[PDB]
């Protein structure tokens, strides 16, 4: 449930784990 990240879930906009 990724409602607190909108938009395109890029890898370079979502670092670490995860």
């Amino acid at each position, epitope marked *: 449930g990724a409602g607190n990240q909108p938009g395109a879930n*890029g*890898a*370079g*906009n979502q670092p*670490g*784990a995860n």
Partner: antibody
């Protein structure tokens, strides 16, 4: 090319405001977030934070909440670092660095903007 | 949050010797899902921004010669140069890339004796 070109050096009297630009070129700007790294003169690296180029959301480390601001202009592929209420602690060289394609390292780096705070 | 204790501060080697340097983290950096360590080694040649050398604790970057090799897992990690050249004098920094804040290490300075 793939280049992060950063603004020129600044001298500012204490308590003033500085704003550094980091113009990115050669890649899809909204798919790689932007990091800011402070390096004091003669000292090591310190991770300030990162702004999500896709959602707009900044993330500041605990030593940089409150006086520091990350912002974006997507239509010009530019990230901004604004330091308000300058202190002599803030005299440093500031780097922008984009997160790599993995999301696990900082791929490309700006040249560095040197900010001197002095009366 | 994570403390990156890096060692030694400086080390001085003849050109051609083998060089090892340690980076130890106060928490584990292994994810257990993607099955890889989130640790990065950077090179800062003097007067320059940091250059990316090694991500995922062992994977060298696109262009890097093979003498730079990264080892270690979980807590203890190690950057190794197998034959130092005269242009390898720089300061080498390890970075936590596991969780916020993505803290750096104090850095190891590499000096050549001749």
């Amino acid at each position: 090319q793939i280049q992060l070109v950063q603004s020129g050096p600044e001298l500012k009297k204490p308590g003033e405001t500085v704003k550094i630009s980091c113009k990115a070129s050669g890649y899809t700007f909204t798919n790689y977030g932007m990091n800011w790294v402070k390096q004091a003169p003669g000292k090591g690296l310190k991770w300030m934070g990162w702004i999500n180029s896709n959602t707009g959301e900044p993330t500041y480390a605990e030593e940089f909440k409150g006086r520091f601001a990350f912002s974006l202009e997507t239509s010009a592929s530019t990230a901004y670092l604004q330091i308000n209420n300058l202190k002599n602690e803030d005299t440093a060289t500031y780097f922008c660095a984009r997160w790599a394609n993995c999301g696990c390292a900082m791929d490309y780096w700006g040249q560095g903007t040197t900010v001197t705070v002095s009366s | 949050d994570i403390v990156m204790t890096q060692s030694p501060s400086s080390l001085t080697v003849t050109a051609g010797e083998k060089v090892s340097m340690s980076c130890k983290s106060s928490q584990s950096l292994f994810t257990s899902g993607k099955q890889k360590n989130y640790l990065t080694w950077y090179q800062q040649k003097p007067g320059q921004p940091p250059k990316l050398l090694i991500y995922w604790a062992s994977t060298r970057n696109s262009g890097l010669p093979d003498r730079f090799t990264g080892s270690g897992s979980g807590t203890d990690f190690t950057l190794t140069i197998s034959s130092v050249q005269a242009e390898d004098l720089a300061v080498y920094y390890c970075q936590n890339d596991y969780s916020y804040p993505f803290t750096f290490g104090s850095g190891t300075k590499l000096e050549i004796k001749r």
